[PDB]
Every structure is written in structure tokens, then in C-alpha cells.
Amino acid sequence: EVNSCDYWRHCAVDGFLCSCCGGTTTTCPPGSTPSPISWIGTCHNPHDGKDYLISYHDCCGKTACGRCQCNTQTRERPGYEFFLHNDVNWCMANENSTFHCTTSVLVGL
Amino acid sequence: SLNPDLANEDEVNSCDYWRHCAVDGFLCSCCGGTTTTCPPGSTPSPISWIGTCHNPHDGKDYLISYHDCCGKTACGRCQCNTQTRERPGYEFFLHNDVNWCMANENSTFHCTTSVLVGL
Amino acid sequence: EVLTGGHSVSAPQENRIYVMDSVFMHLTESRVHVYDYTNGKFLGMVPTAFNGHVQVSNDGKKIYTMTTYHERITRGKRSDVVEVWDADKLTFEKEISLPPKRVQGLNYDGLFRQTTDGKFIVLQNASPATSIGIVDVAKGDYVEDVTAAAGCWSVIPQPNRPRSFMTICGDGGLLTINLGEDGKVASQSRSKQMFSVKDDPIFIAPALDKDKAHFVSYYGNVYSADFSGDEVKVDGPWSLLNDEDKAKNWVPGGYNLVGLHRASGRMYVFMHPDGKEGTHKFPAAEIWVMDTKTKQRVARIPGRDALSMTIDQQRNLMLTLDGGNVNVYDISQPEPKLLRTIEGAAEASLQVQFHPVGGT
Amino acid sequence: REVLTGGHSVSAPQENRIYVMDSVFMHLTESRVHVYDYTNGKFLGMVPTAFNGHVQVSNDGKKIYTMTTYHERITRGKRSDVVEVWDADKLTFEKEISLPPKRVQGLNYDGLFRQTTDGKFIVLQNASPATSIGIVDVAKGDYVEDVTAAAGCWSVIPQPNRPRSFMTICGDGGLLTINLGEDGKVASQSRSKQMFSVKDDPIFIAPALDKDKAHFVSYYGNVYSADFSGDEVKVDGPWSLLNDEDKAKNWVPGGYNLVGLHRASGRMYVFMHPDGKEGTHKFPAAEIWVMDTKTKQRVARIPGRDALSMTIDQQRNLMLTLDGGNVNVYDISQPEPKLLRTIEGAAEASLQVQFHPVGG
Ligand SMILES: *NNc1ccccc1
Ligand SMILES: *NNc1ccccc1
């Protein structure tokens, strides 16, 4: 279920799911580097009915994974609310900004 | 049959057009160029593979030089992979699985042309 | 026969459009595809490396691209640049060095613009702190960051002034920047709150007139910024929606999702039914045509799943783009008329633009 | 609270891994190697390889070697041809080795980028377009020899029975053997007698390689052999793959990396198609034929699944086949291959797949 765009934690992913790319939801595929910065989403947990903060750190420094492309936009907002915005490359400040895939890191309630 | 510019565009832009018999690549005539002119901002290769193609319209065989156009990224249109009389790399100038842009100032492959040399 | 290069684009400038292909699946090989809108013919292309952006010089002679290189693509030193290309030969002419923070992101028009006088390129930076970058076209130089635009996003040129532009800020207002002849900030001003960021967020894409801009919101309201005077006056909301529209939850959706036909005041907007949180980038079920003076819808037509558009004021045309295919419309009358579709113009484009004609 | 981490190794053991070299011909500047687990089809990772990359895994299984071309600005600027050494488990870049700017740019035949049996030297094909063979000393990270004696020859066939010897196919229809010294310089060489007629019965370059001999198939379905049990290569052939029934339907070989040998049995695998004529030598397989190279007779035939390239793993008795996009996994422990699974969407445009080495 984690490799589907409709998995609940992926509600503001614009990118390739890292779990389909040799990584997991919280680990970068081998040889790709986490972004220290990210957009954040608030996603509804369908089990407990509570909303959770998800941090969408990208994995960077390798060319596009190309698998499990998603474009979900729950509570996403334009660049004037920059850290809620997912039409920018969150690898933009990495040593190498080439975008590989997006992770869905659970922060908390 | 010898002058593609006077022919039907749809005819010359087809992989089955008689003079495209050893093309591996994108036809330049679909890429903003013509059979004998590189698309704007791409550079002809000074070297090429050569194929021999039969012209069914006039019954004669012609030497065709497959020069590439170079220094722009892949055109992506009208990809062909025809292999009449094509041979492996130990007959190097008959071989079309190599980039004939290989000696250009910029070797990035854009598209392939089919230039009529003669009988 | 002899193969030659050095050739110009085969169709005249007034026939040309530019489809910015991000090639997201292979984003390091983005490019601009040049097409003839009158017959669908592919005319040529400009390579733009990683996540290129593109615009045409106001005078129609050059193509400006913005991109990022690294010495070894996925490793090595970064170089962010603007490139100047000749429009007719589709050849590289000049590289202008930028600081390594040009915006990397989807191709909204407002990320890469120019002043009305064409003397400055005006681009969005994100480090991720935001600022606006200014490039002096005549000098081939970066000037300096417009630091005043921190916490703001995107560039809306004021077509009634030579070197002024606005940006949308996190307080729901607009910041206006007026450049001097050297490209440095000569003055600035900040409007009152236009929209509630929390309750009625707007799309950044302006429906841009000569002295005002309209913006649509996530809930189908309209806001305006009037910059006829030295200070910007803001207004709204008014609704795009009648009761029937509201009962079926029609809202706007797309990327470069609006356009203004300036002579008539008609605003074009991509819309879809069954709106809710998360549908703001949905493809167009329909295109609505709004009279901005009477504030009523005058037409509605099938959207062809379009996401982005552009308007030509000089030929009374609208292009729409669904990511891969470009639709050409005649908008000389209230109801648009579909002329043709150019199939396979891109693999992943969210931006199309005409070659400028006139516009002085 | 979860924390995102990097630095991880490939999640499956080396013995499960295969390497699909994706040319991405439509966007050839973003070629890459995709790493898959053949046991379950899981995607494990990838290595970027820029323009028209080639790949091989070190014989000891510890490193991945790539060969590629960069330019300072991709489509302009200074060219850099390189070999890169990558860690096989971390899929990270370690070292760049400079090459002269003439490495072969072309489709991914195995024989364009190889290594000596002892693993100490990388042996690669150059074309400027004049041909030569380049030698890279892995330990030193240096290009150490350029074998100009191989002018007019093509491709590299390592000899598995000698530590630093390989052969190449020459324009005279014979083989040139090169024996490198421990410094990577040519220590000796020899030329065979004519093996095949270049004009009348051209061979495919792909070897069906045994420990002490190699077999080649021809455009017309003949088989040639090169026995290198001694210092001088002994050549023979042709024998025909075809019986009279096969000839009546015009069966011939076709593909790219189109043959393989199971060394324990002597079985040779070949992609074949009916209705052969001039120009069909790269056609997808209608069938895979299984030949007994000792008796010089076919033993089995199975559907080809439109495959173009293959590779064999000796120790697990496996054959992979590849149709450009999908990888089929076969068990070849018995004379009839058995299809175990298909990995769909392994590449967009691949003509080469390879197993991770397990021999050492
Ligand atoms: N989420 N990462 C991303 C988004 C948009 C473009 C490039 C990368
Ligand atoms: N014909 N030019 C060509 C062929 C194969 C690869 C790249 C270019």
C-alpha cells in the first residue's frame, strides 16, 4: 500500500515515491542525499481519524527515479506560503540539486 | 523520386522512404530540417555511415550518406531503425549502431539525414 | 546533394509558439519545442538542461532561457544561468551568470519575466529564502537581489510602466518594486491585504491587463489589483459562481490557469466541478469566459483536460495545453472557437507562449 | 518522530542483482543503469550515466564501472570522456578516470566496455572514427595504453582462461589477440587466419563465450568458432544452425547481444526469426533456439517474446532476455528453458542486461 499515490501519508507528494525507487518512506535510495529542507503537509489518518504533519523531504543528487509519480495536493498552497508548496524542487539547496524522489516522513500530530 | 523537397512531406518523413534504408535515428525532415539540411542550430557531421538503397521509382541503386546533425539534444520525432546492407563495426563506415556525431565539436546526437551521393 | 547547417527557422515569427517541455521523467534534458500554430509543424528546439524556464524578448529577436548546470550533472560545481539565444537561428549567443539560487520548479509564467521596456529580466530566487533577481540585458550582468521581496512569490510586470513589477506576499497583499535605470530598487510600496491567505488563497497566475490584474481563488472568487495610480488599490472578492455553479461545487484548477483578453475585458479560466480540498491543480472540465466589467460568465466550453493557457492580444487567440497537446482557439468573439490541436507537442509541459508580435 | 536518513546500501544481496543499461535514447543525455532484484522484480536503485553511458560490474563484485561523456554545458563546451568507479553496495561515485575524447559512442553491445579476466584492467573500444582499444589500470585510476594495432577491428572478447588477454574482430575476417603485461601495456599479440568472409558471411560481434573458446553466429545462420586453448587462436566454421525445414522458411539470427553459452553443457542460445532477408539482422526474436555446440545440432526451440538481447549466469543456470523494456528470467538448468517471470518496465530503451558477478 505505501507504493500507491492514495496511501494516506502521501497526501501532498508532487514527485516519485522513494519507496518505489529502492528506498522507503523514510530512507533515501542508495546514493541519493536527503534534503535538509522540505515542504510539509497535513494528512488525515484513516485509522484513528487524526491529522498528522508529514515532512516531504526529497532525495537528491541522482537523476529522476521515474517510478510511482504522484501529484496529490491536500492542503497544498502556492509559493507565498512557501513551506506548504510542492511545485518547487525541495532539493534546491542540496550540494547537488538534481531531483531523485520524494519521501513522506511522519513528524507527529 | 530523387528530389525529396518536391515530394510529399508524408512520404519523405516515413521510415519506408526509399533513401532511408540504413537510418538508425530521428529523421531530420521531421525535426525542423529537411532531408539535406540540419534543423536550426544543429551542425552536420563531417563523417557518416553510408548505405546503398534501391529507388523503386526509377529502378536504380544509389549511394546514400547518413550524416547526423549534432550539438542539440535528441529530436525525438520519426525514429527509424532500418538496416538494409548495414554491417557491424568491423566494416565501420557501413555501421549504424554508432553515433556519427562522434567527432563533432559537440557530439550530442540530434537527428539523422539521408544525402544522395550518386549511382 | 550536400548537407548544410546555419539555417533559420522555416516559418515566420508570427507563426511560432514555444512549448516548454520539462521532460519531468528526465528533467536534466528539458527543452523548448518551437511549433507553427497555423499548421502544427515542428520547427526546432532549444535545449535547456535541468528544469529550464523560457521567455521571448519583448522585441521578438531573442529567446531567454534560465537553467542549472553542474560540472558532472549529479555532482560538481553548480552554475545557474540565463542564456540568450537567437530566435531565428535557434543558436546560443551569451551566458549570464546567476547566483546559485534561481527557482527550480514548475513553469509558471511569473517565475521568469521581464520589465515592460525589455531592459531587465526579472526572475524568482529561492535558497529557500526568497528574493527577486534582476538581470541587465544590455550589460549581460546580474545586478543584485531584491531582498525586499522576502516571503513573497512570483513576478507580475506592470505593463503601464517601463521597469516596475509586483509580487504576491505572505500577508495577502502585493509588493510593488520600481527599478532605476541601473536595475537597482529605486522605490517600492506595499498594498493593503487583498485576500485572506488562510480563508481564500489565490492562484498566482494573473489575468493581466495594462493597468490592473485579476486573480482567481481556490474557491472561485476573483480579486483585483489596480495599478493605474502610483499606489496599488486592491478589491474583492467577487464570485465566478452562480447558485447552480455553487451547488455543483465548481472551482478553478490548473497551473497557468487564467488569461485576459485586454480589448474586451474577457477573462478565461479553467474550471472543474466537485471542488474540494486538494483539487486546485485538476485539469479543466471546462473553460469559462467571464466579462470582468459586468462580472458575469458569457461562455463555457469543454476544457479538453487543459492545465495551462496563454493569450495573444494581437491575433485574438488562446492556446491551451493539457501537458502534451496544444489546442488553438479563436477568441475574437465571446465564445471561443477551436481551430486545431497539435498532438504530442511535449511530454510534460505546463507552459506555452506565443512569439511576440507588436506589443509596443 | 521519524527521521530521513541517507547512506544506505542496496537492500537485496549481490547475488540477486541485475543491471539494466537504459540508454533512454529519446533523452540520451540522461542514460542510466537500473538495478533490479531478478528473484522478485523489485527496483533496488540506479546509477546515472549522462550521455550514452556504458556499464559493467567488476569481476570481484565490489564496484560498478561506467563509461560516459560529459561537456561543460552538455550541448556545448569542453568534452570529458571518463570511466567512473562506483561502489556496488552504496551506489555512490568514488573515482573518475580521464579518457582521451574518443570513447565509443554507440549502442550497448557487451564488447564495447569489458575487463581482463583478473579484473585489473578495463578494456574499452575507441572510435575517432579511427578505431583503437583503450586500457585503463583500475588500481592506478589511469588510462595506460592505446592499442593502435587494433585499427580496423571492433569489440573486445576477453579470454576467460588467461588473466589479461582479449581478442577483437578485424576487417580481414580474422581475430587479433592482445596479451597485456601486468602494467597494462601490450606484452604480445597475434593474428589468426581468416575465420569468416566479411563480404559473404558477416558475423554478429556478440560472442557465445566459453572458458577456452568463443562461438559467433552469422547473418545467414552459420556458426564460426575461435579456440584459444593455446597462445595462437585456431579458427573454424562454418556449420549451419539450420536444417532443410529451417532453410525453407528462411530462419536467420537477429538481435543485438543475441547469443549466450551455458558452459557446463555447451548449449548455445540464439535469437532467431523466420523470413530472413537483407536488413533483418536486428529483428526481435520469434524464437530462442538452443544448440548443442558439440553435436552441432539444435536441441530445443521456445518462443522469443520479441527479445533483442540476453545474458547468462552460469552458476545459477539462468538466462535473461530483454525486449528493450521488459526483462524475462529463464531457468536453463535443463535443455528447455523455463520462464520464471517477467519484469515489466525495467527500462525505456535498453539493449543490455547483466548479472552481478558471483564467481570472483
Ligand atoms: N517534491 N519535489 C519536487 C516537486 C516539484 C518539482 C521537482 C521536485
Ligand atoms: N545514426 N546516428 C546514430 C546512431 C546510433 C546512435 C546515435 C546516433
PDB file of N, CA and C in Angstrom, chain C residues 77-143:
ATOM      1  N   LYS C  77      30.438  21.452  -9.365  1.00  0.00           N
ATOM      2  CA  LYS C  77      30.022  22.809  -9.107  1.00  0.00           C
ATOM      3  C   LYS C  77      28.763  23.164  -9.901  1.00  0.00           C
ATOM      4  N   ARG C  78      27.871  23.883  -9.234  1.00  0.00           N
ATOM      5  CA  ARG C  78      26.630  24.391  -9.807  1.00  0.00           C
ATOM      6  C   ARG C  78      26.833  25.703 -10.545  1.00  0.00           C
ATOM      7  N   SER C  79      26.202  25.806 -11.707  1.00  0.00           N
ATOM      8  CA  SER C  79      26.117  27.080 -12.419  1.00  0.00           C
ATOM      9  C   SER C  79      24.667  27.357 -12.816  1.00  0.00           C
ATOM     10  N   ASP C  80      24.034  28.338 -12.188  1.00  0.00           N
ATOM     11  CA  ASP C  80      22.719  28.823 -12.606  1.00  0.00           C
ATOM     12  C   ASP C  80      22.942  29.931 -13.605  1.00  0.00           C
ATOM     13  N   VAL C  81      22.189  29.938 -14.703  1.00  0.00           N
ATOM     14  CA  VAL C  81      22.418  30.892 -15.779  1.00  0.00           C
ATOM     15  C   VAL C  81      21.134  31.353 -16.431  1.00  0.00           C
ATOM     16  N   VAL C  82      21.228  32.526 -17.048  1.00  0.00           N
ATOM     17  CA  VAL C  82      20.313  32.895 -18.131  1.00  0.00           C
ATOM     18  C   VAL C  82      21.111  32.746 -19.401  1.00  0.00           C
ATOM     19  N   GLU C  83      20.514  32.129 -20.423  1.00  0.00           N
ATOM     20  CA  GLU C  83      21.108  32.127 -21.761  1.00  0.00           C
ATOM     21  C   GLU C  83      20.290  32.954 -22.755  1.00  0.00           C
ATOM     22  N   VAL C  84      21.016  33.664 -23.609  1.00  0.00           N
ATOM     23  CA  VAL C  84      20.419  34.395 -24.711  1.00  0.00           C
ATOM     24  C   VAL C  84      20.676  33.602 -25.984  1.00  0.00           C
ATOM     25  N   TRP C  85      19.581  33.282 -26.674  1.00  0.00           N
ATOM     26  CA  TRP C  85      19.589  32.542 -27.929  1.00  0.00           C
ATOM     27  C   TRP C  85      18.975  33.399 -29.046  1.00  0.00           C
ATOM     28  N   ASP C  86      19.512  33.257 -30.234  1.00  0.00           N
ATOM     29  CA  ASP C  86      18.923  33.934 -31.386  1.00  0.00           C
ATOM     30  C   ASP C  86      17.627  33.237 -31.768  1.00  0.00           C
ATOM     31  N   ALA C  87      16.548  34.002 -31.924  1.00  0.00           N
ATOM     32  CA  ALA C  87      15.260  33.400 -32.178  1.00  0.00           C
ATOM     33  C   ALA C  87      15.152  32.767 -33.558  1.00  0.00           C
ATOM     34  N   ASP C  88      15.769  33.367 -34.569  1.00  0.00           N
ATOM     35  CA  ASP C  88      15.619  32.831 -35.919  1.00  0.00           C
ATOM     36  C   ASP C  88      16.592  31.685 -36.220  1.00  0.00           C
ATOM     37  N   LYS C  89      17.803  31.713 -35.661  1.00  0.00           N
ATOM     38  CA  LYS C  89      18.770  30.646 -35.903  1.00  0.00           C
ATOM     39  C   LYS C  89      18.715  29.550 -34.834  1.00  0.00           C
ATOM     40  N   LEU C  90      18.034  29.825 -33.729  1.00  0.00           N
ATOM     41  CA  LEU C  90      17.974  28.893 -32.581  1.00  0.00           C
ATOM     42  C   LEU C  90      19.367  28.423 -32.149  1.00  0.00           C
ATOM     43  N   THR C  91      20.262  29.405 -32.023  1.00  0.00           N
ATOM     44  CA  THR C  91      21.641  29.224 -31.598  1.00  0.00           C
ATOM     45  C   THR C  91      21.927  30.004 -30.321  1.00  0.00           C
ATOM     46  N   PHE C  92      22.839  29.439 -29.521  1.00  0.00           N
ATOM     47  CA  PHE C  92      23.305  30.052 -28.313  1.00  0.00           C
ATOM     48  C   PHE C  92      24.204  31.246 -28.612  1.00  0.00           C
ATOM     49  N   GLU C  93      23.954  32.344 -27.907  1.00  0.00           N
ATOM     50  CA  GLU C  93      24.777  33.548 -28.032  1.00  0.00           C
ATOM     51  C   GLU C  93      25.546  33.943 -26.768  1.00  0.00           C
ATOM     52  N   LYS C  94      24.903  33.947 -25.611  1.00  0.00           N
ATOM     53  CA  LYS C  94      25.530  34.511 -24.410  1.00  0.00           C
ATOM     54  C   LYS C  94      24.988  33.807 -23.184  1.00  0.00           C
ATOM     55  N   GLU C  95      25.866  33.587 -22.214  1.00  0.00           N
ATOM     56  CA  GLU C  95      25.536  33.111 -20.900  1.00  0.00           C
ATOM     57  C   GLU C  95      25.702  34.236 -19.888  1.00  0.00           C
ATOM     58  N   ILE C  96      24.695  34.412 -19.039  1.00  0.00           N
ATOM     59  CA  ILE C  96      24.716  35.406 -17.955  1.00  0.00           C
ATOM     60  C   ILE C  96      24.684  34.616 -16.657  1.00  0.00           C
ATOM     61  N   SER C  97      25.686  34.835 -15.830  1.00  0.00           N
ATOM     62  CA  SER C  97      25.815  34.135 -14.573  1.00  0.00           C
ATOM     63  C   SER C  97      24.855  34.631 -13.512  1.00  0.00           C
ATOM     64  N   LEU C  98      24.189  33.696 -12.833  1.00  0.00           N
ATOM     65  CA  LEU C  98      23.303  33.978 -11.711  1.00  0.00           C
ATOM     66  C   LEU C  98      23.897  33.410 -10.433  1.00  0.00           C
ATOM     67  N   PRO C  99      23.481  33.921  -9.278  1.00  0.00           N
ATOM     68  CA  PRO C  99      23.827  33.246  -8.036  1.00  0.00           C
ATOM     69  C   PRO C  99      23.102  31.893  -8.002  1.00  0.00           C
ATOM     70  N   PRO C 100      23.661  30.905  -7.311  1.00  0.00           N
ATOM     71  CA  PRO C 100      23.144  29.529  -7.357  1.00  0.00           C
ATOM     72  C   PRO C 100      21.885  29.301  -6.528  1.00  0.00           C
ATOM     73  N   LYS C 101      20.848  30.061  -6.838  1.00  0.00           N
ATOM     74  CA  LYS C 101      19.576  30.000  -6.145  1.00  0.00           C
ATOM     75  C   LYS C 101      18.402  30.364  -7.057  1.00  0.00           C
ATOM     76  N   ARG C 102      18.552  30.266  -8.379  1.00  0.00           N
ATOM     77  CA  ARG C 102      17.392  30.517  -9.242  1.00  0.00           C
ATOM     78  C   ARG C 102      16.317  29.482  -8.922  1.00  0.00           C
ATOM     79  N   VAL C 103      15.048  29.880  -9.021  1.00  0.00           N
ATOM     80  CA  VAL C 103      13.978  28.955  -8.664  1.00  0.00           C
ATOM     81  C   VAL C 103      14.001  27.716  -9.532  1.00  0.00           C
ATOM     82  N   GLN C 104      13.977  26.558  -8.892  1.00  0.00           N
ATOM     83  CA  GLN C 104      13.788  25.263  -9.544  1.00  0.00           C
ATOM     84  C   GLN C 104      12.378  24.826  -9.214  1.00  0.00           C
ATOM     85  N   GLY C 105      11.546  24.717 -10.244  1.00  0.00           N
ATOM     86  CA  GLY C 105      10.153  24.392 -10.043  1.00  0.00           C
ATOM     87  C   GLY C 105       9.403  24.444 -11.340  1.00  0.00           C
ATOM     88  N   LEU C 106       8.113  24.155 -11.228  1.00  0.00           N
ATOM     89  CA  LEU C 106       7.253  24.081 -12.404  1.00  0.00           C
ATOM     90  C   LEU C 106       7.131  25.429 -13.071  1.00  0.00           C
ATOM     91  N   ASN C 107       6.811  25.405 -14.380  1.00  0.00           N
ATOM     92  CA  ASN C 107       6.924  26.567 -15.266  1.00  0.00           C
ATOM     93  C   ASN C 107       5.737  27.538 -15.234  1.00  0.00           C
ATOM     94  N   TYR C 108       5.471  28.136 -14.069  1.00  0.00           N
ATOM     95  CA  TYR C 108       4.588  29.295 -14.003  1.00  0.00           C
ATOM     96  C   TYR C 108       5.238  30.483 -14.693  1.00  0.00           C
ATOM     97  N   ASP C 109       4.458  31.240 -15.463  1.00  0.00           N
ATOM     98  CA  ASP C 109       4.973  32.408 -16.163  1.00  0.00           C
ATOM     99  C   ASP C 109       5.734  33.349 -15.236  1.00  0.00           C
ATOM    100  N   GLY C 110       5.191  33.560 -14.031  1.00  0.00           N
ATOM    101  CA  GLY C 110       5.696  34.602 -13.137  1.00  0.00           C
ATOM    102  C   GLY C 110       7.032  34.310 -12.503  1.00  0.00           C
ATOM    103  N   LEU C 111       7.622  33.150 -12.768  1.00  0.00           N
ATOM    104  CA  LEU C 111       8.938  32.839 -12.221  1.00  0.00           C
ATOM    105  C   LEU C 111      10.092  33.408 -13.062  1.00  0.00           C
ATOM    106  N   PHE C 112       9.817  33.837 -14.291  1.00  0.00           N
ATOM    107  CA  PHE C 112      10.839  34.242 -15.228  1.00  0.00           C
ATOM    108  C   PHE C 112      10.201  35.206 -16.196  1.00  0.00           C
ATOM    109  N   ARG C 113      10.359  36.511 -15.932  1.00  0.00           N
ATOM    110  CA  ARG C 113       9.667  37.571 -16.650  1.00  0.00           C
ATOM    111  C   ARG C 113      10.675  38.647 -17.069  1.00  0.00           C
ATOM    112  N   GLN C 114      10.168  39.748 -17.627  1.00  0.00           N
ATOM    113  CA  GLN C 114      10.985  40.892 -17.985  1.00  0.00           C
ATOM    114  C   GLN C 114      10.180  42.167 -17.742  1.00  0.00           C
ATOM    115  N   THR C 115      10.896  43.276 -17.591  1.00  0.00           N
ATOM    116  CA  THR C 115      10.207  44.564 -17.438  1.00  0.00           C
ATOM    117  C   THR C 115       9.503  44.887 -18.749  1.00  0.00           C
ATOM    118  N   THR C 116       8.547  45.802 -18.685  1.00  0.00           N
ATOM    119  CA  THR C 116       7.816  46.203 -19.887  1.00  0.00           C
ATOM    120  C   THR C 116       8.766  46.760 -20.957  1.00  0.00           C
ATOM    121  N   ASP C 117       9.811  47.488 -20.554  1.00  0.00           N
ATOM    122  CA  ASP C 117      10.766  48.065 -21.503  1.00  0.00           C
ATOM    123  C   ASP C 117      11.805  47.096 -22.072  1.00  0.00           C
ATOM    124  N   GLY C 118      11.740  45.847 -21.594  1.00  0.00           N
ATOM    125  CA  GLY C 118      12.624  44.773 -22.023  1.00  0.00           C
ATOM    126  C   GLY C 118      14.069  44.895 -21.582  1.00  0.00           C
ATOM    127  N   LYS C 119      14.375  45.868 -20.720  1.00  0.00           N
ATOM    128  CA  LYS C 119      15.757  46.138 -20.355  1.00  0.00           C
ATOM    129  C   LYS C 119      16.278  45.224 -19.232  1.00  0.00           C
ATOM    130  N   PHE C 120      15.356  44.686 -18.451  1.00  0.00           N
ATOM    131  CA  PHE C 120      15.705  43.819 -17.316  1.00  0.00           C
ATOM    132  C   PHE C 120      14.910  42.519 -17.379  1.00  0.00           C
ATOM    133  N   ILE C 121      15.611  41.418 -17.146  1.00  0.00           N
ATOM    134  CA  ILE C 121      14.989  40.143 -16.847  1.00  0.00           C
ATOM    135  C   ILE C 121      14.789  40.084 -15.349  1.00  0.00           C
ATOM    136  N   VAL C 122      13.638  39.604 -14.953  1.00  0.00           N
ATOM    137  CA  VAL C 122      13.201  39.613 -13.571  1.00  0.00           C
ATOM    138  C   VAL C 122      12.773  38.202 -13.245  1.00  0.00           C
ATOM    139  N   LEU C 123      13.497  37.584 -12.315  1.00  0.00           N
ATOM    140  CA  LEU C 123      13.324  36.156 -12.016  1.00  0.00           C
ATOM    141  C   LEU C 123      13.181  35.874 -10.524  1.00  0.00           C
ATOM    142  N   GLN C 124      12.551  34.764 -10.173  1.00  0.00           N
ATOM    143  CA  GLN C 124      12.400  34.355  -8.797  1.00  0.00           C
ATOM    144  C   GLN C 124      13.587  33.518  -8.321  1.00  0.00           C
ATOM    145  N   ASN C 125      14.131  33.876  -7.153  1.00  0.00           N
ATOM    146  CA  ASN C 125      15.157  33.107  -6.451  1.00  0.00           C
ATOM    147  C   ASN C 125      14.540  32.405  -5.258  1.00  0.00           C
ATOM    148  N   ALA C 126      15.115  31.265  -4.893  1.00  0.00           N
ATOM    149  CA  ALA C 126      14.743  30.579  -3.664  1.00  0.00           C
ATOM    150  C   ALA C 126      15.931  29.776  -3.176  1.00  0.00           C
ATOM    151  N   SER C 127      16.344  30.053  -1.942  1.00  0.00           N
ATOM    152  CA  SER C 127      17.561  29.474  -1.402  1.00  0.00           C
ATOM    153  C   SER C 127      17.464  28.534  -0.190  1.00  0.00           C
ATOM    154  N   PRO C 128      16.342  28.371   0.522  1.00  0.00           N
ATOM    155  CA  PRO C 128      14.970  28.553   0.095  1.00  0.00           C
ATOM    156  C   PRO C 128      14.398  29.945   0.433  1.00  0.00           C
ATOM    157  N   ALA C 129      15.156  30.804   1.120  1.00  0.00           N
ATOM    158  CA  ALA C 129      14.695  32.184   1.282  1.00  0.00           C
ATOM    159  C   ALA C 129      14.468  32.786  -0.082  1.00  0.00           C
ATOM    160  N   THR C 130      13.393  33.556  -0.205  1.00  0.00           N
ATOM    161  CA  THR C 130      13.003  34.082  -1.497  1.00  0.00           C
ATOM    162  C   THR C 130      13.497  35.512  -1.672  1.00  0.00           C
ATOM    163  N   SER C 131      13.897  35.814  -2.895  1.00  0.00           N
ATOM    164  CA  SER C 131      14.227  37.153  -3.333  1.00  0.00           C
ATOM    165  C   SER C 131      13.991  37.194  -4.831  1.00  0.00           C
ATOM    166  N   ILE C 132      13.966  38.391  -5.409  1.00  0.00           N
ATOM    167  CA  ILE C 132      13.831  38.523  -6.841  1.00  0.00           C
ATOM    168  C   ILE C 132      15.156  38.912  -7.426  1.00  0.00           C
ATOM    169  N   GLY C 133      15.561  38.230  -8.491  1.00  0.00           N
ATOM    170  CA  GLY C 133      16.799  38.521  -9.152  1.00  0.00           C
ATOM    171  C   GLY C 133      16.594  39.401 -10.377  1.00  0.00           C
ATOM    172  N   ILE C 134      17.517  40.320 -10.592  1.00  0.00           N
ATOM    173  CA  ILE C 134      17.451  41.249 -11.701  1.00  0.00           C
ATOM    174  C   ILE C 134      18.674  41.075 -12.572  1.00  0.00           C
ATOM    175  N   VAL C 135      18.441  40.881 -13.877  1.00  0.00           N
ATOM    176  CA  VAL C 135      19.466  40.784 -14.884  1.00  0.00           C
ATOM    177  C   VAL C 135      19.393  41.951 -15.868  1.00  0.00           C
ATOM    178  N   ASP C 136      20.524  42.620 -16.072  1.00  0.00           N
ATOM    179  CA  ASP C 136      20.669  43.739 -17.001  1.00  0.00           C
ATOM    180  C   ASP C 136      21.008  43.149 -18.356  1.00  0.00           C
ATOM    181  N   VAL C 137      20.025  43.196 -19.247  1.00  0.00           N
ATOM    182  CA  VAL C 137      20.159  42.610 -20.586  1.00  0.00           C
ATOM    183  C   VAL C 137      21.283  43.249 -21.420  1.00  0.00           C
ATOM    184  N   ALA C 138      21.356  44.573 -21.422  1.00  0.00           N
ATOM    185  CA  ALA C 138      22.394  45.274 -22.172  1.00  0.00           C
ATOM    186  C   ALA C 138      23.814  44.932 -21.683  1.00  0.00           C
ATOM    187  N   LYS C 139      24.000  44.861 -20.368  1.00  0.00           N
ATOM    188  CA  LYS C 139      25.308  44.552 -19.795  1.00  0.00           C
ATOM    189  C   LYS C 139      25.647  43.058 -19.788  1.00  0.00           C
ATOM    190  N   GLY C 140      24.627  42.204 -19.864  1.00  0.00           N
ATOM    191  CA  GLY C 140      24.845  40.752 -19.690  1.00  0.00           C
ATOM    192  C   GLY C 140      25.267  40.395 -18.275  1.00  0.00           C
ATOM    193  N   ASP C 141      24.702  41.113 -17.303  1.00  0.00           N
ATOM    194  CA  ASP C 141      25.120  41.040 -15.898  1.00  0.00           C
ATOM    195  C   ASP C 141      23.937  40.824 -14.977  1.00  0.00           C
ATOM    196  N   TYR C 142      24.188  40.118 -13.881  1.00  0.00           N
ATOM    197  CA  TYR C 142      23.282  40.113 -12.748  1.00  0.00           C
ATOM    198  C   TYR C 142      23.500  41.413 -11.985  1.00  0.00           C
ATOM    199  N   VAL C 143      22.432  42.065 -11.579  1.00  0.00           N
ATOM    200  CA  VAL C 143      22.514  43.317 -10.826  1.00  0.00           C
ATOM    201  C   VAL C 143      22.629  42.947  -9.346  1.00  0.00           C
TER     202      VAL C 143
END
